[PDB]
Amino acid sequence: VAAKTLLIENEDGKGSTRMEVQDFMKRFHMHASEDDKTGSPSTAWGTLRFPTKEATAPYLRLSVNDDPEDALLFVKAMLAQKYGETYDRPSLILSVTGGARNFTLPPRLETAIAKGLRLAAQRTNAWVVTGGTNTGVMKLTGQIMEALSKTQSHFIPPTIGIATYGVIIGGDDMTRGEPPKIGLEYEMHKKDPPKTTPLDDNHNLFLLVDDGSTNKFGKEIKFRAAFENAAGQAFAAPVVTIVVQGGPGTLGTALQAVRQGTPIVVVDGSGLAADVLAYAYNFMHNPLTRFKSYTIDDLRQKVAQTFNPKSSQQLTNLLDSALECVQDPNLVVVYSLQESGIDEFDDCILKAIFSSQGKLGNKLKQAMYFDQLDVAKRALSEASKNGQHNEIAACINDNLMAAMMHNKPHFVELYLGFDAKIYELKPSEEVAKTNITALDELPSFALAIEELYKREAKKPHSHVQRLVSLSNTDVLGRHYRLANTRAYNVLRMDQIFARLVSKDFSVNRDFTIYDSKYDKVPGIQFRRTAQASHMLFLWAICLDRFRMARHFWLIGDQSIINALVASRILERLSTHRALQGPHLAEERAKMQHNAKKFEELAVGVLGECHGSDSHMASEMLHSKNDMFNKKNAINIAYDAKSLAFLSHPATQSVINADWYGHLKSVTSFWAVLFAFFFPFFVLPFINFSGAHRLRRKFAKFYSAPYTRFISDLLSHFVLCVVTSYFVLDKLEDTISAIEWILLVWFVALLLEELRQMIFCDGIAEYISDTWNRLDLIMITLFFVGFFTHASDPSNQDSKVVSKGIHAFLVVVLWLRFMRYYALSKNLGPKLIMMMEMMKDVSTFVFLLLIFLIGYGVAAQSLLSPDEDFSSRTFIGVLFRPYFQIYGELFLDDLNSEANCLGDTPFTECSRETVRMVPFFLAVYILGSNVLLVNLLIAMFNDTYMKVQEAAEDLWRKQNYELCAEYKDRPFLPAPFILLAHVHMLFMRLLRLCGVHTQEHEKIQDDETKRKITTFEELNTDKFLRRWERERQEMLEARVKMTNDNVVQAMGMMDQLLEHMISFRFSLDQQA
Amino acid sequence: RVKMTNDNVVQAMGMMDQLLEHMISFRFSLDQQA
Ligand SMILES: Nc1ncnc2c1ncn2[C@@H]1O[C@H](COP(=O)(O)OP(=O)(O)OC[C@H]2O[C@@H](O)[C@H](O)[C@@H]2O)[C@@H](O)[C@H]1O
Ligand SMILES: CC(C)CCC[C@@H](C)[C@H]1CC[C@H]2[C@@H]3CC=C4C[C@@H](O)CC[C@]4(C)[C@H]3CC[C@]12C
Ligand SMILES: CC(C)CCC[C@@H](C)[C@H]1CC[C@H]2[C@@H]3CC=C4C[C@@H](O)CC[C@]4(C)[C@H]3CC[C@]12C
Ligand SMILES: CC(C)CCC[C@@H](C)[C@H]1CC[C@H]2[C@@H]3CC=C4C[C@@H](O)CC[C@]4(C)[C@H]3CC[C@]12C
Ligand SMILES: [Ca+2]
Ligand SMILES: [Ca+2]
For residue A141, which ligand has an atom nearest its CA? 1
Neighbours of A33 (CB within 10 A): 11
User: Considering just the CA atoms, what is the radius of gyration of chain A in Å?
Assistant: 43
Half-sphere exposure of A19 (CA within 13 A, CB side): 13
The CA distance from A36 to A45, in Å, is: 20
Cα gap A421→A923, rounded to integer Å: 84
Query: A184 and A191 in contact (C-beta within 8 Å)?
Result: no
Read off φ and ψ for residue A425, nearest 5 degrees: -80, 140
A772 is in an annotated binding site: yes
Q: Under 8 Å CB-to-CB from A149, ≥6 apart: which residues?
A: A156, A157, A159, A204
Contact A598, A570 (CB under 8 A): yes
**What number of CA atoms fall less than 13 Å from residue A669's CA on the CB side?**
8
Q: Residues with Cβ < 8 Å from A18, sequence gap 6 or more?
A: A5, A6, A7, A8
Closest listed residue to residue A510, CA positions, set A530, A539, A487, A536: A530
For the purposes of burial, counting CB atoms within 10 Å of the CB of A432, is it exposed (0-12), middle (13-18) or buried (19 or more)?
exposed
Measuring CA to CA, how many Å separate A638 from each of A87, A483, A494, A620, B27?
45, 35, 20, 17, 70
Rounded Cα gap, residues A634 and A642, in angstroms: 11
| Ligand 4 binding site (Cβ under 6 Å of any ligand atom) | A 912, 915-916, 919
Report how far Cα A84 is from the mean position of its chain's Cα atoms: 28
Burial class (CB in 10 A: 0-12, 13-18, 19+), A542: buried
Alpha-helix residue ranges (DSSP H) falling in A419-505: 437-440, 444-457, 463-469, 490-501
Exposed / middle / buried, residue A800 (Cβ in 10 Å: 0-12, 13-18, 19+): exposed
CA A558, A564, A568, A573 dihedral sign is: positive
Nearest CA to ligand 2 atom 21: A801
Q: Which residues of B touch A1070 (CB under 8 A)?
A: 30, 34
Secondary structure letter of residue A185 according to DSSP: E
Cα separation, A464 vs A242, in Å, equals 41
- The whole-angstrom separation of Cα B34 and Cα B31 is 6
Number of C-beta neighbours around residue A657 at 10 A = 17
Distance CA A94, CA A845 (A): 77
Provide the 10 A C-beta neighbour count for residue A719. Answer: 20
Instruction: List CB contacts of A76: < 8 A, sequence separation 6 or more.
Output: A8, A9, A16
Question: Dihedral of CA A583/A587/A589/A592: which sign?
Answer: negative
A127 beta partners = A93
Burial A514-536 (b: 16+ CB within 10 A, else e): beeeeeeeeeeebbbbbbbbbbb
Terminal alpha carbon distance of chain B: 48
Give yes or no for a cis peptide into A522 (omega within 30° of 0): no
Q: Given CB atoms, is A338 within the 8 Å cutoff of chain B?
A: no
Name the CA radius of gyration of chain B, rounded: 15
Whether A838 and chain B come into contact, CB under 8 Å, resolves to no
> Alpha helix (H) ranges present in A261-388?
272-280, 296-306, 312-325, 345-354, 360-367, 374-385
Quote the CA–CA distance of A1064 and B26 in Å, as a whole number: 11
- DSSP of A544-564, one letter per residue? T-HHHHHHHHHHSS-HHHHHH
Could you give the CA distance from residue A228 to residue A241 in angstroms, rounded to a whole number? 10
Test the A interface: residue of B17, B27, B28 with most A CBs within 10 Å: B27
Kindly provide the b/e burial profile for residues B1-34, where b requires at least 16 CB atoms within 10 angstroms of the residue's own CB.
eeeeeeeebeeeeeebeeeeeebeeebeeeeeee
Q: Which residues pair with A625 in a beta bridge?
A: A631
In DSSP notation, A2-43 reads: --SEEEEE-SS-SSEEEEEHHHHTTSSEE-SSSS-SS-EE--
What DSSP line would sit under A790-819, residue for residue? HH-SS-HHHHHHHHHHHHHHHHHHTSSTTG
Distance of CA A222 to the CA centre of its chain: 50
Sheet with A93-96: list strands edge to edge: A181-185, A46-49, A57-63, A205-210, A159-164, A127-130, A93-96, A239-243, A264-267, A332-335
**Cβ within 8 Å of residue A173, ≥6 positions away:** A187, A190, A192
What gap in Å lies between CA A711 and CA A650, rounded to an integer? 28
Report in angstroms the alpha-carbon separations of A1005 from A468, A636, A1008: 39, 22, 5
- Residue A283 alpha carbon to ligand 1 centre in Å: 27
SS3 A528: helix
Could you give the CA distance from residue A724 to residue A550 in angstroms, rounded to a whole number? Answer: 61
Beta bridge partners of A264: A241, A332
Detail the DSSP E strand segments found in chain B: none
Of A778, A780, A775, A741, which is closest to residue A756 (Cα–Cα)? A775
Q: Where are the alpha helices (DSSP H) in A821-932?
A: 827-863, 871-882, 891-897, 917-926
Q: Is the CB of A166 under 6 A from ligand 1?
A: no
For residue A126, the number of C-alpha atoms closer than 13 Å in the C-beta half-sphere is 31
The 10 Å Cβ neighbour count of residue A34 is: 14
Closest C-alpha among A300, A665, A639 to residue A501: A639
* Cα–Cα distance measured from residue A7 to residue A24, given in angstroms and rounded to the nearest whole number: 10
Region of residue A99 (left: phi > 0; alpha: psi -120 to 50; beta: else)? beta
Chain B residues touching A1045 at Cβ < 8 A: 6, 9-10, 13
Q: What are phi and psi of A736, to 5 degrees?
A: -75, 160
- Cα–Cα distances in angstroms (integers) from residue A819 to residues A761, A827, A831, A837, A955, in the given order: 20, 10, 9, 17, 12
- Give burial (CB, 10 Å; 0-12/13-18/19+) of A366: buried
C-alpha count within 13 angstroms, C-beta hemisphere, residue A198: 14
A95, containing H or E segment? strand A93-96
Strand extents, DSSP E, A142-193? 159-164, 181-185
Q: Name the β-bridge partners of A585.
A: none
Q: Which residues of A touch B21 (CB under 8 A)?
A: none
| Of the partner residues A1056, A1066, A1070, the one whose CB lies closest to the CB of residue B20 | A1056
Tell me the nearest-neighbour CA distance from A461 into chain B, angstroms: 47
CB atoms B23 and A1060 under 8 Å:
yes
User: How far is Cα A321 from Cα A253, in angstroms, rounded to an integer?
Assistant: 10
Alpha helices in A729-795 (DSSP H): 737-758, 763-768, 770-791
Distance A571 CA to ligand 3 centre (A): 48
- Check if the beta carbon of residue A265 is closer than 8 Å to that of residue A242: yes
Q: Does ligand 1 lie within 6 Å of residue A303's CB atom?
A: no
Q: Which residues contact A663 (CB under 8 A, 6 or more apart)?
A: A686, A688, A689, A700, A701, A704
Specify the experimental method: cryo-EM
For ligand 3, say whether the CB of A841 is within 6 Å of any of its atoms: no
- Between strands A5-9 and A16-20, the pairing is antiparallel
A1043 and B CB contact within 8 Å: no
3-state secondary structure A107-151: HHHHHHHHHHHHHHHHHCCCEEEECCCCCCHHHHHHHHHHHHHHH
Encoded amino acid at A1014, one letter: T
